[PDB]
Design a protein around this ligand. Structure first.
Ligand SMILES: Nc1ncnc2c1ncn2[C@@H]1O[C@H](COP(=O)(O)OP(=O)(O)OP(=O)(O)O)[C@@H](O)[C@H]1O
Ligand SMILES: [Cl-]
Ligand SMILES: [K+]
Ligand SMILES: [Mg+2]
Ligand SMILES: [Mg+2]
Ligand SMILES: [Mg+2]
Length: 1005
């Protein structure tokens, strides 16, 4: 099993961590001490990630209050040992990870069986120090974490010696160079930014004239603006001539950690929130004081909301400040109000805080196992005090926060009973049931959100469960693959908290325009707020627009590998998701794709397009030509690529295969065309020694002169191009004939083919720049030469019943030849242009647009969302109380900012909210009266009334049609069915005679 990773399970996580880090993880034995909510959350993430084994220690009996955040305990478990009852449920998370229970820790030498030891808040500070001393002195990595109500911390001690092998997890930077001067000044090609920072290291390739500079030697970077950097003298290597590519290399970094005992008096802090810098040292003394309080008082924490205990904690912190003078520093007084809240909340057990630290700490465990990413060094403290409701609405005292003998006692401890009841009675829509959705439903189950008679949860997701989902969608099991995500998730969390039984309406509908009959006005209007758990801009933007329309708050969030974000959208207050979006990533120039690739990303895009044309569009165009009597006529109206469409039909029918041998021949001939003849044609038009107008080499920089390929069936890429191409063609034409192709079989067919020789077309123009005109446009064909191709098409009557079967691209079925073809095809073109070839996993990442994902980040971001949710429940209108988050666990880095206020505008002298305000019109008004009323009371000379894309009115004949009739007219005579409201968008002029931006209209039918 050594060295093997199950890519079909770990696919998305492999794109975060890499194979080497996971191989180190699969050798590491982890021990977690304490299996309340914090411990089980950490264990859940580490077991999903795949370590060698997980061992849990917790002999304490389950009590009902433990269920606040321990999602694997049930009321039937009370009195049993937490470790014992949790082991079997953790074991079900990942069959590759054995989960054991450690019965006793009296003998500390047992720790020597483990590589990483995690001490949660069940471990006293006295025991944490003893355990850390044993781990530190033995070479065992040590991590501890504690949560106390809305506060928490983590401590990391990986020993005297630890090597970071990759500090960031980012793709290495690369770039093309146009000069390296004798002093090492490197000039970037054209406008290309290097993207490097001082102190980075690079190696070089293709630098002609400097020979051994390309041998993998590393050079330390001194940046000289964003388009040049310096590497020190290169005189010893020669004299630059031309060419070159730099590649950033991450070098190992040896670091050293101090023990817990040393760090108690002289801590090294990583801050979680730059608005709260000064709180870290205060909380550092406070968390210690809580332990001292417990040793005084028979192991008990301060009493909930108890002011006597709080005053005692403050004195403990004061005394400790004198013993630990370097913590606060000189002249800094104890923040007594802060310590008071810590005392008041010490017993609290809050799902969002547990999820935040569970995700952070589990990732630190994986860093400890692997050397991947930069460990936290060494203390981080956190609070989410902004989550507290306004005491005017929900007073906090010993009466309101007292236990009621329920699983929620330690959330009540913080928020009070009435606030928890308001959570129970909340009405929420969750859009999506994947990674964030599953974690979200778990958090809500622990909150009891929707368990109240007036509350409920709706969750919708049209997708089914797939194997790779299981790595981070922890409510799903191997047996659940193929079932509907939302339905399985709802059932799973109601087992975790039967209080939610019957309160989760699991739907399998896709959210978007086509389901507004389902998600109608009554549906949205009833909601308290909406939570997104989506993975695409279209769905996120659509939900955002509904939330704006219905003025519902929206909780947005996302992850990308180790990075994540949260966004709070509040009606009449903040920007929305849509207005905050970033302009799209610039696309690859078409000439670069078509003729001058220089990165594997370019050859993969090209190969994916060829795949689409060969095996999807070609088949569809045939079927349409055979089925629609007007196809040819339509194809000149619709056009786009008339020449290409008609040629594909003619090719598809004239060269139809009769057996599998015919498909092999076809694929071998396409190999010759794409990787030999077309390349000789390019070189005919642009000889290797050709010059531009200004006498410089045409083939320089981003233009890499290719060499045609001579087919070699022992080259893996040539072989698999033909295998995959033939199999997909055989699929197209319903031919049948092996998962293992036989090289000798294929070789016998190909060996006996006659391969047409290349003859150049000497009258072609190939586009060099995208600014230049397009030689291969419909305008570049001619209205006369298409007739030949049309009349040469066989009439459908000669092909009765003939049908081609189009391929639907599926990146995640490794037996279907899709990624095989794209990888081989890409790599053959990479061979043409001397680009390094890529394996199937990288090709699948790019061609499939897979998003790197891991449960640690998913759980952490979800925790942060639920800390903002508390603020919706209190109807907070102070924008300064909300927190938009950005996280990068690689670093680790945490940043928070208050949301951005909605832009405000003026159609002069009237102030409006450019996002949330609109004109509400009662009734199906006649067009003329609507135009009038804008002049009457809004003083607007309306100039463009549009419904969706079309313009119902434009000043560039005359209508007295009620809007509902007007829309029918211009939308090909369709009848609105369930529509009670209609959104219209206006362009207008103001009383001063000037065009103004104006809010949209709602027609209430
Ligand atoms: N318009 C929509 N309506 C409802 N659910 C949606 C919509 N668009 C996307 N989703 C859901 O959002 C969820 C996003 O979760 P996530 O991306 O973790 O899972 P996934 O897409 O199956 O995994 P992967 O991206 O790794 O294949 C998906 O389950 C997806 O079905
Ligand atoms: Cl390359
Ligand atoms: K020519
Ligand atoms: Mg400098
Ligand atoms: Mg999916
Ligand atoms: Mg997805």
């Amino acid at each position: 099993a050594a060295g093997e990773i199950d890519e079909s399970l770990y696919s998305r996580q492999l794109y975060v961590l890499g194979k080497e880090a996971m191989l180190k993880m699969q050798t590491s034995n982890v021990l977690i001490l304490g299996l309340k909510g914090l411990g089980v959350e950490i264990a859940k993430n580490v077991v999903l990630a795949g370590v060698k084994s997980m061992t849990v220690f917790d002999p304490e009996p389950v009590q009902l209050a433990d269920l606040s955040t321990q999602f694997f305990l049930t009321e039937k478990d009370i009195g049993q040992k937490r470790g014992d009852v949790t082991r079997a449920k953790l074991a079900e998370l990942n069959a590759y990870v054995p989960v054991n229970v450690l019965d006793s820790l009296d003998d500390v030498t047992q720790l020597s069986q483990f590589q990483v030891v995690v001490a949660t808040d069940t471990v006293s500070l006295e025991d944490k120090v003893k355990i850390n001393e044993f781990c530190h002195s033995s070479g065992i990595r040590f991590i501890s974490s504690e949560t106390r109500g809305l506060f928490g911390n983590t401590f990391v001690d990986l020993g005297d010696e630890f090597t970071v092998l990759d500090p960031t997890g980012e793709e290495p930077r690369t770039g093309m160079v146009s000069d390296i001067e004798p002093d090492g000044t490197v000039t970037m090609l054209d406008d290309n930014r290097h993207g490097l920072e001082d102190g980075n290291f690079v190696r070089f390739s293709e630098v002609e004239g400097l020979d051994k500079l390309n041998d993998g030697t590393l050079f330390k970077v001194e940046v000289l603006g964003p388009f040049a950097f310096r590497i020190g003298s290169v005189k010893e290597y020669g004299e630059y001539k031309k060419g070159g590519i730099f590649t950033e290399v991450k070098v190992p970094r040896k670091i050293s950690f101090k023990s817990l005992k040393q760090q108690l008096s002289n801590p090294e802090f990583v801050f979680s929130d730059f608005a709260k810098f000064d709180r870290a040292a205060q909380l550092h003394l406070g968390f210690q004081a809580l332990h001292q309080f417990a040793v005084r008082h028979n192991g008990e924490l301060p009493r909930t909301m108890n002011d006597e205990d709080a005053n005692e904690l403050i004195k403990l912190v004061t005394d400790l400040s004198v013993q630990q003078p370097e913590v606060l520093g000189e002249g800094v007084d104890v923040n007594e109000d802060l310590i008071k809240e810590l005392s008041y909340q010490a017993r609290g057990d809050i799902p969002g805080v547990v999820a935040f630290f569970g995700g952070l700490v589990a990732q630190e465990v994986l860093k400890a196992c692997s050397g991947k990413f930069t460990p936290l060094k060494q203390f981080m403290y956190f609070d989410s005090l902004e989550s507290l409701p306004d005491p005017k609405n929900f007073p906090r005292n010993e009466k309101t926060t007292q236990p009621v003998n329920s699983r929620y006692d330690n959330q009540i401890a913080v928020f009070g009973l009435d606030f928890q009841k308001k959570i129970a009675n909340s009405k929420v829509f969750l859009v999506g049931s994947g990674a964030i959705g599953c974690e979200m439903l778990k958090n809500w189950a622990l909150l009891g959100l929707g368990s109240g008679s007036d509350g409920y949860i709706v969750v919708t997701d049209n997708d089914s469960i797939e194997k790779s989902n299981l790595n981070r969608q922890f409510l799903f099991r191997p047996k659940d693959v193929g079932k509907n995500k939302s339905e399985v998730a709802a059932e799973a969390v109601c087992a975790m908290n039967p209080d939610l039984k019957g309160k989760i309406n699991a739907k399998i509908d896709k959210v978007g325009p086509e389901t507004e009959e389902i998600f109608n006005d009554s549906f949205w209007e009833s909601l308290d707020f909406v939570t997104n758990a989506l993975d695409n801009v279209d769905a996120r933007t659509y939900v955002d627009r509904r939330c704006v329309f219905y003025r519902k708050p929206l909780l947005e969030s996302g992850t990308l590998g180790t990075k994540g974000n949260t966004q709070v959208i509040i009606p009449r207050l903040t920007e929305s998701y849509s207005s905050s979006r970033d302009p799209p990533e610039k696309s690859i120039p078409l000439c670069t794709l078509r003729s001058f690739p220089n990165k594997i990303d370019h050859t993969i895009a090209w190969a994916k397009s060829l795949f689409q044309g060969y095996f999807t569009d070609s088949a569809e165009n045939v079927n349409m030509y055979l089925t629609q009597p007007n196809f040819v006529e339509q194809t000149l109206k619709q056009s786009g690529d008339v020449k290409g469409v008609l040629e594909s039909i003619s090719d598809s029918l004239s060269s139809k295969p009769h057996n599998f041998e015919d498909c092999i021949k076809w694929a071998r001939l396409e190999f010759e065309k794409k990787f030999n003849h077309d390349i000789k044609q390019l070189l005919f038009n642009f000889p290797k020694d050709a010059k531009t107008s200004n006498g410089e080499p045409f083939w320089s920089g981003a233009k890499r002169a290719p060499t045609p390929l001579e087919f070699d069936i022992y080259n893996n890429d040539h072989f698999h191009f033909v295998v995959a191409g033939a199999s997909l063609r055989a699929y197209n034409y319903g031919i049948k004939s092996n998962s293992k192709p036989n090289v000798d079989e294929y070789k016998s067919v190909i060996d006996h083919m006659i391969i047409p020789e290349f003859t150049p077309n000497a009258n072609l123009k190939i586009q060099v720049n995208d600014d230049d005109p397009d030689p291969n446009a419909n305008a570049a064909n001619g209205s006369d030469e298409i007739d030949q191709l049309v009349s040469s098409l066989p009439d459908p009557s000669t092909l009765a019943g003939f049908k081609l079967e189009p391929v639907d691209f599926e990146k995640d079925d490794d037996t279907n030849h899709h990624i095989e073809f794209i990888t081989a095809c890409s790599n053959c073109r990479a061979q043409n242009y001397f680009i390094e070839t890529a394996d199937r996993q990288k090709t699948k990442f790019i061609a499939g647009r897979i998003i790197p994902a891991i449960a640690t980040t998913t759980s952490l971001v979800t925790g942060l969302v639920n800390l903002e949710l508390y603020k919706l429940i209190d109807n907070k209108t102070d924008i300064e109380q909300y927190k938009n988050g950005f996280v990068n666990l690689a670093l680790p880095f945490f940043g928070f900012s208050e949301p951005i206020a909605s832009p405000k505008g003026e159609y002069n002298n009237k102030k409006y909210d450019k996002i949330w305000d609109r004109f509400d019109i009662k009734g199906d008004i006649k067009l003329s009266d609507l135009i009038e009323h804008f002049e009457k009371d809004e003083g607007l000379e309306i100039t463009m009334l549009s419904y969706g894309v079309s313009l119902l009115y434009a000043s560039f004949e005359r209508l007295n049609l009620p809007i509902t009739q007007l829309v029918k007219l211009v939308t090909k005579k369709d009848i609105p069915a369930h529509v009670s409201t209609m959104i219209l968008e206006i362009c207008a002029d103001d009383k001063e005679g000037e065009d103004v931006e104006v809010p949209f209209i709602t027609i209430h039918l």
